Paper text:
Cyclic β-1,2-glucan synthase (CGS) is a key enzyme in production of cyclic β-1,2-glucans (CβGs) which are involved in bacterial infection or symbiosis to host organisms. Here we performed functional and structural analyses of the cyclization domain of CGS alone from [name] (TiCGSCy). In the present study, we explicitly showed that TiCGSCy domain alone produced CβGs by transglycosylation reaction without hydrolysis.
A ligand-free structure of TiCGSCy was determined at 3.9 Å resolution. The enzyme consists of a single (α/α)6-barrel domain with several inserted α-helices. A large pocket observed in (α/α)6-barrel domain is expected to be a substrate binding site of TiCGSCy. The shape of the substrate pocket of TiCGSCy is similar to those of TfSGL and CpSGL in that the substrates observed in TfSGL and CpSGL complex structures can be potentially accommodated in the pocket, although the superimposed glucose moiety at subsite − 3 is a little too close to TiCGSCy. There is a sufficient space beyond 2-hydroxy group of the potential subsite − 4, which is consistent with the fact that TiCGSCy prefers Sopns with larger DPs. Contrarily, W1394 is likely to block binding of glucose moieties beyond subsite + 3. In the case of TiCGSCy, E1442 is found with a clear electron density at the position corresponding to that of the nucleophilic water in TfSGL, which attacks the anomeric carbon of the glucose moiety at subsite − 1.
Residue numbers in the entry: 1011 to 1584
C-alpha cells in the first residue's frame, strides 16, 4: 500500500511528465508530439513523430483529464485537432507511416509502415473512443481539477502559491462551483501581487484563465448580475445548478430552466421580462455550446472508430507463417523478411487487435512463439531483447488476468530485471533507451538494452543503460520496487523539468572519465507517454485497460489473455 505522501510524489511526476506534451505539442507541430527534446546537447526538439508517439499523446490527453490536468473542453479540443491532422496524413491501406515530419506532415525518408507502430496506435485510439464518452456525465467541475491544480502549483512554484493553499477545497469529497470560483480568484489575486519569474506567473494565470474559462462559458449561472439573481425562477434553480455540473446533467437542467422562463414570462412586469430575457439569452448559448461539445465528442468517437476499421492489418500478415511481419517496406513494395515470432513482444498489441478486428484467425494468437525460461523457481516467457517495454508496453491497454501465462511472465520479468540490476548496483529496468553517445550532429543514440536472460538472442556486453520509463511501465507489479527506483533515480539526478530523463548510462566505455553515470539529458515523447499513462493506470486502477476492454471486438478476444501456464511439459526430441 502507498502513503498519501508517496502518491503525491507519483502525481507530481505524472504532472511534470504531462508537461512534455503541454509544452512541445504546438500548432506548429500540427498538434503532434515530436519524438524527443534533448536538453544538455541543446539540439532542442526533433520535428519527427511516429504513429506510436501520436497514439500515446491522444491517450495521455484522456489521462490528463483523469488526473485533472486539463478541463473536459480542453481535452476534446486537443483530440479533435490532433485527429484532424491524422485524417490528413498520407496513409497506406489505412495505416500511418513509420515516421512523419511534425511540420511537412510528410512520410519520412525510408517510406515504411511498422506493424507495432500501427498496432499500438490502433489500441490507443480504441481506448480514447471508449473513454471520451465518459466525460458527458463526468462533472465539468469535479474535485480532480483541484487535485490537478495542486500538482500544477507544486510544479510551477510561484511565491504565495504553495500546496497548503488547497487543504480546505481538497478536504471535501466534492467541489462546489462557488467554493471553486472563490478559490480560483483567491489564487488569481496572490498571483497579481507575487513578483516571481513573470514567465512562471504567466503559466499559472493561463492555467487559472483556462479553469474559469470552462466555468464562465458552461456554468453561466455564475455570470448573472445581482438583479437577475433575484428573479424567483433563479431562487428555485440555485441548489440544482450547484448539484449538477456534467454536460448532460446541465443539458437537462438548462432546458427545464428555459421552458420555465417561457412559462413565467407572460406573468411578469416589463422590468421582470427584461431580466428574464437576459437569462433566457445567456442560458440559450450555454445550451447551444453543450449540444456542440456532445456533438464534437461523437464526431471524435466516429472519426476514431472509422480510422481503426480502415486499418488493414491483413497486409502485414504472412498467411503462410500464420505470423505478423515486422512491417512493410513501401520502397521495394515488399513485406519485411523477419517476423514477430514471439508472444513476449509489443507485437502482441498488434497481433491481438488483428484477431479482435477479425482480420486474422483466433489461432494466430497461439502460433506466436511461447518460450519459458525457468530461472530459480519463477518461470516466464522470454522475449527477443529483454527490454521491459517488450513485456509491459501492452499493459497500458491490454489487461492482465491472474495466474495466466502472461501474468507469471509479467512478474518473472520484474524479478530477473531487478536481480540483474542489483547484481550490477544500478537501478533496475534496463530497456530500449538513449545512451551517452552521439551522431555527427550531437544527438543521443537510441538502442535496444535488454537483460540477456529474458533476451532470447543477445550480445550480453556491459551496456548498463537503465531507462526509468521501463521501471515505471511495471508500477502495476512491484509498486514498492518502482518507488525505490524513483528515489534512487532522484539521488542519481534523473529528475528533470519533464519528469525522468530518457536514461542513465553507467557504461564504462561511454561514461566521461572521473565520473560514474552519464545522464542522457533528453525527454522522448513515446517514453514520456508510457510513464504518464502507466502512472494514471496505477493511480486510477488500470482505467485505460478497462476502457480498451469496454470495446466489444476487444472483449470478444479478452479470453486470450486468460491463457493459463501449463502444469506438464514434454522434454524429449527426434
Amino acid at each position: 500500500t502507498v502513503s498519501q505522501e508517496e502518491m503525491e510524489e507519483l502525481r507530481l511526476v505524472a504532472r511534470k511528465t504531462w508537461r512534455y506534451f503541454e509544452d512541445f505539442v504546438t500548432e506548429g507541430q500540427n498538434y503532434l508530439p515530436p519524438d524527443n527534446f534533448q536538453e544538455d546537447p541543446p539540439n532542442g526538439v526533433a520535428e519527427r513523430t511516429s504513429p506510436t508517439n501520436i497514439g500515446l499523446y491522444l491517450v495521455s490527453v484522456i489521462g490528463a483529464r483523469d488526473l485533472g490536468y486539463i478541463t473536459t473542453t480542453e481535452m476534446v479540443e486537443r483530440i479533435k485537432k490532433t485527429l484532424d491532422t491524422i485524417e490528413k496524413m498520407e496513409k497506406w491501406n489505412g495505416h500511418l507511416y513509420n515516421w512523419y515530419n511534425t511540420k511537412t506532415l510528410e512520410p519520412l525518408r525510408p517510406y515504411y509502415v511498422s506493424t507495432v507502430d500501427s498496432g499500438n496506435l490502433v489500441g490507443y485510439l480504441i481506448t480514447v473512443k471508449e473513454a471520451i464518452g465518459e466525460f458527458l456525465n463526468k462533472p465539468l467541475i469535479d474535485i480532480e481539477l483541484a487535485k490537478g491544480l495542486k500538482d500544477t502549483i507544486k510544479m510551477l512554484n510561484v511565491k504565495g502559491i504553495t500546496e497548503d493553499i488547497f487543504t480546505t477545497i481538497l478536504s471535501k469529497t466534492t467541489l462546489v462551483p462557488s467554493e471553486w470560483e472563490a478559490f480560483l480568484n483567491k489564487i488569481r489575486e496572490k498571483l497579481l501581487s507575487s513578483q516571481d519569474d513573470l514567465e512562471n506567473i504567466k503559466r499559472l494565470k493561463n492555467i487559472i484563465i483556462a479553469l474559469k474559462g470552462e466555468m464562465k462559458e458552461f456554468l453561466v449561472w455564475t455570470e448573472f448580475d445581482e438583479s437577475e439573481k433575484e428573479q424567483e425562477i433563479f431562487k428555485r434553480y440555485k441548489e440544482v445548478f450547484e448539484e449538477h455540473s456534467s454536460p448532460k446533467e446541465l443539458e437537462k437542467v438548462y432546458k427545464n430552466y428555459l421552458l420555465e422562463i417561457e412559462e413565467v414570462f407572460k406573468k411578469a412586469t416589463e422590468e421582470e421580462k427584461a431580466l428574464l430575457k437576459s437569462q433566457k439569452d445567456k442560458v440559450a448559448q450555454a445550451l447551444e455550446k453543450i449540444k456542440k461539445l456532445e456533438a464534437e465528442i461523437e464526431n471524435i468517437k466516429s472519426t476514431i472508430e472509422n480510422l481503426v476499421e480502415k486499418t488493414e492489418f491483413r497486409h502485414l500478415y504472412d498467411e503462410k507463417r500464420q505470423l505478423f511481419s515486422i512491417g512493410y517496406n513501401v520502397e521495394e513494395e515488399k513485406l519485411t523478411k523477419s517476423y514477430y515470432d514471439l508472444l513476449a513482444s509489443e507485437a502482441r498489441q498488434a497481433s491481438f487487435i488483428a484477431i479482435a478486428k477479425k482480420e486474422v484467425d483466433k489461432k494466430h494468437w497461439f502460433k506466436l512463439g511461447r518460450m519459458l525460461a525457468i530461472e530459480n523457481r519463477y518461470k516466464g516467457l522470454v522475449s527477443w531483447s529483454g527490454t521491459m517495454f517488450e513485456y509491459f508496453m501492452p499493459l497500458l491497454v491490454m489487461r492482465n488476468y491472474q495466474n495466466t501465462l502472461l501474468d507469471e511472465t509479467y512478474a518473472f520479468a520484474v524479478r530477473v530485471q531487478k536481480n540483474y540490476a542489483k547484481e550490477l548496483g544500478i537501478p533496475w529496468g534496463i530497456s530500449e533507451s538513449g545512451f551517452y553517445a552521439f551522431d555527427m550532429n550531437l544527438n543521443y543514440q537510441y538502442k535496444a538494452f535488454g537483460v540477456p536472460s529474458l533476451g532470447l538472442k543477445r550480445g550480453l556486453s556491459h551496456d548498463k543503460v537503465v531507462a526509468p520509463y521501463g521501471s515505471l511501465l511495471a508500477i502495476g507489479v512491484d509498486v514498492e520496487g518502482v518507488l525505490q527506483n524513483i528515489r534512487f533515480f532522484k539521488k542519481e539526478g534523473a529528475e528533470g523539468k519533464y519528469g525522468f530523463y530518457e536514461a542513465i548510462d553507467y557504461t564504462p566505455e561511454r561514461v566521461p572519465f572521473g565520473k560514474k553515470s552519464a545522464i542522457v539529458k533528453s525527454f522522448m515523447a513515446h517514453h514520456q507517454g508510457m510513464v504518464f499513462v502507466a502512472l494514471d493506470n496505477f493511480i486510477n486502477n488500470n482505467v485505460m485497460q478497462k476502457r480498451f476492454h469496454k470495446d466489444p471486438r476487444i472483449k470478444a478476444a479478452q479470453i486470450l489473455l486468460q491463457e493459463k501456464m501449463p502444469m506438464y511439459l514434454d522434454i524429449t526430441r527426434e
